[PDB]
Design a protein around this ligand. Structure first.
Ligand SMILES: [Zn+2]
Ligand SMILES: [Zn+2]
Lengths: 20, 155, 451, 145, 48
């Protein structure tokens, strides 16, 4: 199960930029 | 020594009389040449650089040319041994300085690795190298190359 | 014992340094042979080499063993052939920085460079200029920054503080004879300088490459397929493929930017199709199995980027026929613009970026040849001036301004002596010690100086 | 010699058409663009072979259930069950397919490989038939200049 | 064509002066003459 969660895991790192 | 057709009768008789021949008709040619060639090499190199300096700083002088013709026999031996640099010495004076070049240096300079390194240096200095620091990179290249030459010679 | 083993280990290290490239080519050939005999594998969940009349199964194991051994030999021959040069460059750079700029005195380095921070624990050891063919650098910097800063504050961070104090004290009638005890040189050898050297070598790129090579060669024993990664050495190693790979590595940035622009354009086409073309993406097999449609934005974007780009005829050949009303002309425009913008003028760009690199490299080479054939490297006067006497420029560049001659002169000045220099030699040596270089002929020569 | 063998078989006279290339100089401006680099072209073909071998070992190690070129159903053959067979299949079909190799194998809809195999085919496409044939053509175009 | 335009610009900037346009050879008689002439005597920033 990695065809759909890959983009979600890639975007989950930019939350540290969204909080700033 | 007489089959090489280099030594005449006088030279053969001289080299035979200059032998040790200490009661045994046997000579240690190792010590013989290391006694009669080591200082001869240095003094001959000094005479050769003197004559070269005179010839390049006093041309059109037949009185010196006739001497150079007879000195050519020994001047050719030190041909791949003396260098010549044109430096800026006294105020606005291009001085031609001479010096000795080692056989080890002229052997380690002709290696393919050093030649390729020099080619690459010329390439990437003509392409992206500057004008104000050209000698600044050239002396660094010279230092790196003489370092690798020392390293490859001590192995 | 100690002498007879040191004179043997030195000979062994000299052999490994003399045979670095030879062992490199031998390791390449061994990897080639391993990958050639890897062409005889079969599956049974179990990989088996059942392809010959023997003599192929044990030879692979002995070849892998030999390959790992020769990779270790190469990685320890590099340490004796190329590491001295890089540490020499590092020491030269840091010493000249210390003397001419006052880096660790008045111009403390920033945090944007690791070299300036790692070269700090090397200025205060005993054997700091180990490979610089000179040791009078600490004295120079002390005499240069002695009264403008702390006379003791300089030596406290340049080392030799208490050493110089003890030397000035022992200059009087107090001097013993130092003894030499065998098997007790671990205290004599410097550990901090060795630590700095190990940091430098572990930072070196060409050493990390060989480390990765040996790591893959080791993993090749756990799985006899990582020996395929050793074929990348024919590209990242020897320079026999530079003329070909340079055409791709030259732009690089242009190629990734082109791929990004292609991705953006395909995303544009994807949103247009998702918003206006639903009843076409119907890649059903055997009938009544509607799947791989455009019912998902990510799915449709992947479908586009994976099929329409590689289809060779745009995307209008992988979807349904555009015979429906209200879309017969809109979808035709869609496919034809996709074709002309994605696989016609966006692959022509990728190929033009590869074709232009060849011309640029050739122009660089021809420009180098021309600048070498028309002017002199040192004085830079020109070919026309020297082409007045028969074969003048060639003689001028082979006798008067020979780069090899200048290199040999610098070597002679460095290795001759200090108190035996003549007038000109001492003048040039002084100028070289201050790093000024006004003694190089700028725009004059012995022929322009006279008649 | 070939003209003589043409009597034993009236087809070696076809080898005499090579004289229009290896003989007269009416075709030098065209054939010189290919004969100029030469070494660059063989090195490019060798690099292509090496890259295709890399893709072949990757597929042999990670993609087994895809190379299933069966005809009429339930005839699994021409698979990747052999390294040499898979390498020949790649070098013979994926290079000439014009769309990489992702168009000659099964559909990559399976789990754990849906994205890995997509990356596989798209990198094969962009590295083998996009920037490794552009090199071959640039080597021919630069020779004219 | 774009690369040729860029190289032509670089050449016209490296061989002649922008204001007087004399040439590189004339100023390359004193050591590092053209660079000093274009950085001190005819500086576009100085004119601005
Ligand atoms: Zn010159
Ligand atoms: Zn001007």
């Amino acid at each position: 199960m990695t065809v759909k969660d890959m983009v979600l895991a890639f975007f989950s790192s930019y939350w540290s930029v969204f909080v700033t | 020594m007489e089959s090489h057709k280099h030594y005449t009768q006088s030279e053969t008789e001289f080299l035979l009389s200059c032998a040790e021949t200490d009661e045994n008709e046997t000579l240690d040619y190792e010590e013989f040449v290391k006694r009669f060639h080591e200082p001869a090499k240095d003094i001959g190199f000094n005479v050769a650089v003197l004559l070269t300096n005179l010839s390049e700083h006093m041309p059109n002088d037949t009185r010196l040319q006739t001497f150079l013709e007879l000195a050519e026999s020994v001047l050719n031996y030190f041909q791949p041994f003396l260098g010549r640099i044109e430096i800026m010495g006294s105020a606005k004076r291009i001085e031609r300085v001479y010096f000795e070049i080692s056989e080890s240096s002229r052997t380690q300079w002709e290696k393919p690795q050093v030649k390729e390194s020099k080619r690459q240096f010329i390439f990437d200095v003509v392409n992206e190298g500057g004008e104000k620091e050209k000698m600044e990179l050239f002396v660094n290249f010279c230092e790196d190359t003489i370092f690798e030459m020392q390293l490859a010679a001590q192995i | 014992f100690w002498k007879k083993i040191i004179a043997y280990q030195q000979k062994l290290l000299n052999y490994f340094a003399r045979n670095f490239y030879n062992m490199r080519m031998l390791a390449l050939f061994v990897a080639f042979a391993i990958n050639f005999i890897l062409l005889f594998y079969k599956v049974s969940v179990h990989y088996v080499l059942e392809e010959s009349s023997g003599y192929m199964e044990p030879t692979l194991r002995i070849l892998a063993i030999l390959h790992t051994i020769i990779s270790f030999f190469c990685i320890i021959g590099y340490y004796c052939l190329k590491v001295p040069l890089v540490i020499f460059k590092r020491e030269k750079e840091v010493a000249r920085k210390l003397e001419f700029d006052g880096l660790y005195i008045t111009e403390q380095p920033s945090e944007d460079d690791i070299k300036g921070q790692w070269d700090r624990l090397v200025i205060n050891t005993q054997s700091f200029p180990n490979n610089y063919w000179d040791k009078f650098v600490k004295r120079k910097v002390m005499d240069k920054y002695g009264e403008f800063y702390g006379r003791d504050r300089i030596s406290e961070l340049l080392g030799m503080d208490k050493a110089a104090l003890d030397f000035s004290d022992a200059r009087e009638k107090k001097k013993p004879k130092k003894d030499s005890s065998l098997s007790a040189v671990l205290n004599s050898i410097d550990v901090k300088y060795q630590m700095w050297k190990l940091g430098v070598v572990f930072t070196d790129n060409s050493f990390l490459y060989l480390a990765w090579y040996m790591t893959m060669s080791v993993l090749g024993h756990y799985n006899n397929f990582f020996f395929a990664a050793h074929l990348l050495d024919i590209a990242m190693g020897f320079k026999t493929l530079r003329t070909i790979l340079s055409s791709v590595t030259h732009n690089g940035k242009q190629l990734v930017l082109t791929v990004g622009l292609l991705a953006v354009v395909v995303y544009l086409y994807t949103v247009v199709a998702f918003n206006f073309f639903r009843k076409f993406y119907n890649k059903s097999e055997d009938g009544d199995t509607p799947d791989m449609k455009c019912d998902d934005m990510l799915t449709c974007y992947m479908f586009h980027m994976y099929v329409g780009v590689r289809a060779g005829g745009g995307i209008g050949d992988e979807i349904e026929d555009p015979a429906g009303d209200e879309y017969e002309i809109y979808r035709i425009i869609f496919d034809i613009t996709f074709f002309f913008f994605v696989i016609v003028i966006l692959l022509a760009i990728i190929q033009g970026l590869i074709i232009d690199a060849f011309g640029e490299l050739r122009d660089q080479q021809e420009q180098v040849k021309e600048d070498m054939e028309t002017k002199c490297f040192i004085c830079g006067i020109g070919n026309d001036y020297f082409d007045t006497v028969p074969h003048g420029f060639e003689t001028h560049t082979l006798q008067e301004h020979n780069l090899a001659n200048y290199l040999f002169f610098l070597m002679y000045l460095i290795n001759k002596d200090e108190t035996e220099h003549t007038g000109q030699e001492s003048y040039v040596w002084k100028m070289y010690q201050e790093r000024c270089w006004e003694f190089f002929p700028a725009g004059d020569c012995f022929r322009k100086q006279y008649e």
